Amino acid sequence: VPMVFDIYSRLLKERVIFLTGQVEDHMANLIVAQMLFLEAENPEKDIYLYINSPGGVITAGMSIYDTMQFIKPDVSTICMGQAASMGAFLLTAGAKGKRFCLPNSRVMIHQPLGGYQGQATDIEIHAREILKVKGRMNELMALHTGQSLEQIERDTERDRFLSAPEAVEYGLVDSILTH
Amino acid sequence: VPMVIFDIYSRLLKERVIFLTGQVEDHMANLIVAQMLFLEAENPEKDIYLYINSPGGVITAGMSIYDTMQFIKPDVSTICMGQAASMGAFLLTAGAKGKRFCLPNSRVMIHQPLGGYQGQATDIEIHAREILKVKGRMNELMALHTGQSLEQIERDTERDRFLSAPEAVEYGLVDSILTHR
Amino acid sequence: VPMDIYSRLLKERVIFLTGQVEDHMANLIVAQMLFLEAENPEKDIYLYINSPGGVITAGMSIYDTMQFIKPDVSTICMGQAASMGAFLLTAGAKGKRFCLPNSRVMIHQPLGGYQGQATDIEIHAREILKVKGRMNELMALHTGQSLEQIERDTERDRFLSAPEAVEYGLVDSILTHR
Amino acid sequence: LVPMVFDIYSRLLKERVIFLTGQVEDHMANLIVAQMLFLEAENPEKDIYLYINSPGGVITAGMSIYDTMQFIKPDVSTICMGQAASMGAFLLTAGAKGKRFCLPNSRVMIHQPLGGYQGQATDIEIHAREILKVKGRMNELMALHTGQSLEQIERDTERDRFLSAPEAVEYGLVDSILTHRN
Amino acid sequence: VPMVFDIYSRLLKERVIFLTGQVEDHMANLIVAQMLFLEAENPEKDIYLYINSPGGVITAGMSIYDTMQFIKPDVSTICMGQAASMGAFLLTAGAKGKRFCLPNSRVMIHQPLGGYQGQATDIEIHAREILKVKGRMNELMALHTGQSLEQIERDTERDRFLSAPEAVEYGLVDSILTHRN
Amino acid sequence: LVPMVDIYSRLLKERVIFLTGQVEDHMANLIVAQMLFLEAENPEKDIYLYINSPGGVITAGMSIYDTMQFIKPDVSTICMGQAASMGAFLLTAGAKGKRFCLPNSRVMIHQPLGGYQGQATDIEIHAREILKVKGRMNELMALHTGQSLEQIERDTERDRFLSAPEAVEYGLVDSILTHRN
Amino acid sequence: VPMVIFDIYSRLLKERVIFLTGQVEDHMANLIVAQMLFLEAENPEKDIYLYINSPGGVITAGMSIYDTMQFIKPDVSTICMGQAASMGAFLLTAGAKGKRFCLPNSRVMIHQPLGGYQGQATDIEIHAREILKVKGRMNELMALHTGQSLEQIERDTERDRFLSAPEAVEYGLVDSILTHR
Amino acid sequence: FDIYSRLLKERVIFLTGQVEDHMANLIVAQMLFLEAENPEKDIYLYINSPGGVITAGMSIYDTMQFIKPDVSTICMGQAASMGAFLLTAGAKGKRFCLPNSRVMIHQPLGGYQGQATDIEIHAREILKVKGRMNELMALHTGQSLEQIERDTERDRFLSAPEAVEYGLVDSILTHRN
Amino acid sequence: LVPMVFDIYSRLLKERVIFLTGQVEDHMANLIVAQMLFLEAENPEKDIYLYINSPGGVITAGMSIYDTMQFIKPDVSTICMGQAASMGAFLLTAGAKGKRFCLPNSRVMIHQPLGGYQGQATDIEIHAREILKVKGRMNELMALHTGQSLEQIERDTERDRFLSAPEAVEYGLVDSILTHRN
Amino acid sequence: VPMFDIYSRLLKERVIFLTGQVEDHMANLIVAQMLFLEAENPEKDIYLYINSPGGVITAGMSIYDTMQFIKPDVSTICMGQAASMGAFLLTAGAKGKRFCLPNSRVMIHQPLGGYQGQATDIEIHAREILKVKGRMNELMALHTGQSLEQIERDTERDRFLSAPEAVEYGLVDSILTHR
Amino acid sequence: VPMVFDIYSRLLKERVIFLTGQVEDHMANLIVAQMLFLEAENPEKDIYLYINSPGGVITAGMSIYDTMQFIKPDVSTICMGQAASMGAFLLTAGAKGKRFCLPNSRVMIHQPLGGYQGQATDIEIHAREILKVKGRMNELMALHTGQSLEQIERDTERDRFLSAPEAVEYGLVDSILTHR
Ligand SMILES: *C(=O)N1CC=C1/C=C/C(=O)NC(=O)/C=C/C(C)=C/C=C/[C@@H](O)CC
């Protein structure tokens, strides 16, 4: 926190938000607030969301996704370091043509995780829900990547790593940032 | 905690935006009550905006928010982002009619009250009676805000029941879905 | 264990109920009663009781065994007999229930607790009251008190001295000396 | 985090509003006393508003607030939101007669004092004797503010008892229910 | 503990086995060993199984059930204290005409419980298995009690207590042992 | 506590061994000792191995497997309750025609589990060994069940449950033990 | 507890000096990226100075700094004080050609990547293949910045190796040694 | 008597689990006992172990070589680090693996905290142990010291057939008689 | 509790006073390095004053300070108050010649390096060899700044060695003792 | 910490508080406050309130050497208690300006310590703590006016002194009752 | 554990005692009891003490030393695995000419260890005591090994390991057992 009002605040005045670490309700709500704030200051200028995350909660990540799609400004996504699970999902949800990976970035995709304890009836309720989510997520990933739903299904059954150039060909990102 | 040129949650509080985040409990809820009472004093005519992303929490804490929402003059518009479960779903539906919203991929889970007690059998009967009264009042308010019958709310809350953003408008929990600005 | 010593007294038909009452120690008490019956179904059994309470179900497995087996089960309270230990004390064969001069007895209503959904909460609270009702019935049966009196005296902890227990009806007499 | 405007609670304090939230204990209660003394000094005649959402707490801590409400000239209007149990229910009814309020779905719980001690039978008698006096004064003060008899307060507090907002009006703990701002 | 040698061993010479506490692989394996041992001593004389259990693992309980049904001697079941989850299953799995409750016994029945963590694919695998178990347990309940399959399901969805006389009327046991002879 | 008459020892004179709980080096070494002991007393009489296990270590389980195959007497395997991971493997390793399930037994098969921390060079070494182990386990499974190696690989990639009748049709077991003689 | 004047690290940021201290991880690395992006905006032409005193850390986090150094226009001069091990040593040599430095008693340590995973053998193969790709790419970039052959980087990093300040010059990790100003 | 003891009267010893001072002494005592009963008949040491302390394991090794009777070693399940060492120390021609037994070998492990002077002392000793340990391996397997040095620098697994080729074991047991 | 004026340590930093306190480690040492670079920027002529009260710490962390002390233009004066052990005692003697000081009842303690490692024998040899190289360079630097022979520093650091304030001026660790100001 | 700070507002009055056990970090700030006050005016007295149950020897001696080195006289006031190192610094105040409050308590005892290791190392550290013990007794005798042989006999075991007992023994000059 | 009856007792009927693991008051008292018992059964036949120990308390170890020297039977010592600190002391305390190492046994020697918390006065008392111990242990080591007191001092100041052959030349052991 290089005080002056730290440094992350200086770069917020330039419309740059940092998504770092595990994604969860509180850090995600903080990202939503920043995106809503930047929209209010200027709904026409793009927003820049850097992503370096190993994954996190689905609900928390989707609160960011819906905010990215809701606000008028385009949200450009930049992956530095790694973007796994929901971090990869939000990376691909950026505005078309403005999704980027750095040359030595790293991306991992897989299916949702979950768990429940209780009576068998409750187990059925919660099991059928996480599958509904899996279908919702594969559909959305297929939409943003251009792959078919069936392809997303086969590649997310188990963890799958993609390099920065592999991430462009598969369709999660548009190009690689250089210079 | 990013700051402008003075904190971000405070800056959005000037635009009349309140965030209900995380587990619901007496202190975070009392903070929501304070923001609602504050916004009312500065301008009773204008709407209030309550974002809800919560997996549930205490009933007593949530009802301090509910009664404050209905008591203050300004309408409180409720916006569900991420998820709104248990009391988070209840407060979502308590927003002003026509101003309840879900985001396209939001989620809302509903169930009956939870509780527990240890002690003498006489004391157990007292608390078992009260928790059943709580369950009754919540279903009544749930039926009132959704337009559903009391018997349907009873049927659907006995066990956990997840609901999608469009399913929440059908069931009556919310009025519409926010899709792009 | 001086050894075995509890077994040497088992051949004299002496069973010891000691400590908290729970499924495992109670099952051992039931096994000894079944064993002593097999040895001689006509002779009395002697159950010393020194317990601060315990589980009802575990205690009722002992109660049901005493009533089922042919031999009369004489009960002797030494030290103290509280909650479920007091229940089994008074369940002894009429006329063969005893307290020692400085024994103590405590009675109260059942304890319990549960977590879960309101529907499930309602089921278990309705069951513990059924249990509370039955014990009060059995308490009234063995002591001779009215069901209304057992209710009033068990709503809160009540202590009874050895002579107070003979007047209340929990026990028949006091063992002083041989 | 607490939003800014100074704190959020600090501006509603300028509006003569104090918030009693959570367990009541020496420190949070002492803070409530400090706010009350501050508002009295600013203007002794204007009312003070005390919102109450508490599941109970220490008796001694609660009585430092009670005596402060009774001591200062300004009337202390009490508002129950969420719940007001054990010590929270006591301070609710100690508000200025005519200015005690519940919200429509508030819940109030009353019960007798609780305690505990380890030590000498001699010391046990001393502490068991004090807690019974506290129970006595607590019941008397409750009877005073509610209009109920001392004999009635004793019976209803022997075991936990829940009261709805309208039930709290009829029993006398609170004067009316606030539903919509006039 | 009382080495008469060992009291539970002396009672085994009389064909009496004790199922006590939580049912699990190890305590259940001992019961199977006792049943197989008693069968070898005399395949004709009955075996007596006392049951005081608050529940346990199904798989462990089913190893006892299949052994009870497989061996030639009839296995009479006696409920003392309480018989919940698997304890109620093994109680009613005793020989038709030889299942007993004590006057103040208590029986509780409910559906299976479980839990799993992992990938959604794995969750679907395990969640489908526990539902298969639920189906077979309810089927076995209908067989041994005489109740319909539809009835066992409706009564086991949530915890259901049965008194000793109630367990006789329902078909869980046949009679109540009160005072020998 | 163990009912004496020991009970597992009195059944050891009947050539009955019990494999119970998680399989590991110490309990498995004891199973080898009982098999070697029974072989010495009579290399022509069959051995009876009851299996009720949720899985365990591979090496420990394979010490039992190689012992079962080495001794002269046939080792008949009986699954009661459940037979998961390595427990299911040893079930199918029983002597041809002498593998049994009880009517309500449950069999579970899956691929090997493992994990390692260290330098990348060491990671490759252990990742390669578990892949060799995985390959050998599928080969042995295919040999004893009659299924193809391709089929075993499909069926073990993720947890798969088989009922007693599903285990006979698959080749894990030869028949089901229902009643005696 | 940094000493104020701004703060000490900020007053030193106005001179284009960034500090990489302690273990490398997502958060401490992200702040370094923010500082580099900020300094680029203040002046894309003036060099940036990165002091490095680290015993290692996460690769992914370290590569976010590497990619940022290569992405921004200004040259990033790296200074090693104390020690620079694992990813700290990688970023040390990723500095601008001609502007990488060690202090007289600095120490550099290089070794291959470390890692670990638990799960199914199939998942094990996936993650083991990935850490080896990372090992390959890291070795490739190291050979690039040092001028050494890939075989040499592979052969010297299989095990921990320490380099003194002068040794780091003749190896290619650093360009020269800073002694007196 | 007991099952492990009942098999001891037939000269069968079980080395199971981690190797450590106390379990190893039981192995040493049984070998001395057996020797006293009959110094000619062979002794049978089954091995299923993931490793353990060197000194404790070497107390077994020196006892096997010291006692008159031949000590036959049989690996069931797995025989790693020192367990692999003792497997190979069995009497020549009477060392055995089961068809699906596994074997893992690696160099010694250790650690110490203290002054630099003391660190040098203990680091010099573990390298002396490593030398003697590799020497003994070359003697019993027939491999060259250079080969043992290359193959133990990092963990190395050997299957039952690989263990007969490498020289750790003499043959593979499949069926009795 | 961080006295204010402004802060107190910030007020003395403007006077070119740096405090080395407690255990030496990467972060507290990095903070000391930053202050030295800052003071150099303000005026590369004036001297810097480093008070030392430490029981030791990591060598790499201490050497980041040492190399900074020698690299920057201004002289770094060292003052030992309380104690200066292992890494504290070296930084003390590494101060600018003629400006190294002990207070009258200060204490200096020196010894050889401590360390440890777990792993394969091959890895043990690498780390055992390296720590012996560090010990060598430390004795080399210690001998250079004190004026003692390398063999003497070796014989005196093999085991713990305590030195009083007057013992430290003769041994060569410090130049003189400050008893009273001016 | 009411109000800008209260300890900072009394620092303008040249009042320093030594509270709690003495250790390297809390002692460093007292040194910093003394050095700061010296710079502000080397001629006005400094006021050191002492309420401490003891602490580390080295940490306490950094304060002692600072008290004696700076030009201004350091007046010491004992309130509550002054035990081990707290008692030593109390008596180290400028002669004639050491004070006790009427019901303050002073406790003195010999140094405490401990070590694990080789016998040779045991001799070194036991030899050193006895040197520390030797100095501390010398300085106490120097500041109190007592004989060295007396300080030794009286510090071998815990010795409590009342405020009036402290004036006869020499630790302090007078007692501040009222004013 | 293998009830032959029992295995360690079966070998106690061959006058064989096992000193295994850490040396401490209770395991040492058990060793003392066996030595006193064997003396009672036959004061003439040698006793055989196998030693595999990484060290332990000095006083506990010296209770064994004084018993070996007090009883009439000679105590032959066998080092298997390792014999460190007090284990090495008792190894060499065996009857001269009857001390043995196995081919790959390991002996480690060093000076005493200790520690104390308290007042400086008490610190000196316990420090003077451990040094008196240190001086007394070195004396006996010199007596049993044939080395000089100065050599024992120099060589125990720091950990020093000795192989089986190194132990015969230093005087710790008489010969190496290899076959029978
Ligand atoms: C000198 O210190 N160095 C050269 C090699 C070293 C190693 C130092 C080392 O391990 N230092 C520590 O971690 C020391 C920690 C201590 C002594 C902490 C003391 C804390 C106080 O609270 C004790 C009263």
From Swiss-Prot, chain E:
The subcellular localization recorded is:
Cytoplasm
Impact reported for residue 2 to A: Reduced processing, no ClpA-ClpP complex forms
Cellular component, GO, one term: cytosol
Any single GO BP term: response to radiation
Upon deletion of the gene, what happens? Cells undergo an apoptotic-like death upon DNA damage characterized by membrane depolarization. Decreased persister cell formation upon antibiotic challenge probably due to increased levels of MazF toxin.
Q: What is the effect of changing residue 1 to A?
A: No ClpA-ClpP, little ClpX-ClpP complex forms
Outcome reported for the amino acid change (mutating residue 7 to A) = No ClpA-ClpP or ClpX-ClpP complex forms
Note the effect listed for residue 8 to A: No ClpA-ClpP or ClpX-ClpP complex forms
Per UniProt, activity regulation is: Inhibited by benzyloxycarbonyl leucyltyrosine chloromethylketone (Z-LY-CMK).
Which is one GO molecular function term here?
serine-type endopeptidase activity
Question: Could you give the domain comment from the record?
Answer: The N-terminus (residues 17-34) interact with ClpA and ClpX.
The miscellaneous remark of the record is: Acyldepsipeptide antibiotics bind in the ClpA or ClpX binding-sites, rendering the enzyme ATP-independent and indiscriminate, thus killing cells.
Q: How does it assemble?
A: Fourteen ClpP subunits assemble into 2 heptameric rings which stack back to back to give a disk-like structure with a central cavity, resembling the structure of eukaryotic proteasomes. Component of the ClpAP and ClpXP complexes.
NCBIfam families the UniProt entry points to: clpP, PRK00277.1, PRK12553.1
What role does it play? Answer: Cleaves peptides in various proteins in a process that requires ATP hydrolysis. Has a chymotrypsin-like activity. Plays a major role in the degradation of misfolded proteins. May play the role of a master protease which is attracted to different substrates by different specificity factors such as ClpA or ClpX. Participates in the final steps of RseA-sigma-E degradation, liberating sigma-E to induce the extracytoplasmic-stress response. Degrades antitoxin MazE.
By what name is this protein known?
A: ATP-dependent Clp protease proteolytic subunit
Species lineage: Bacteria, Pseudomonadati, Pseudomonadota, Gammaproteobacteria, Enterobacterales
Gene responsible for this protein: clpP
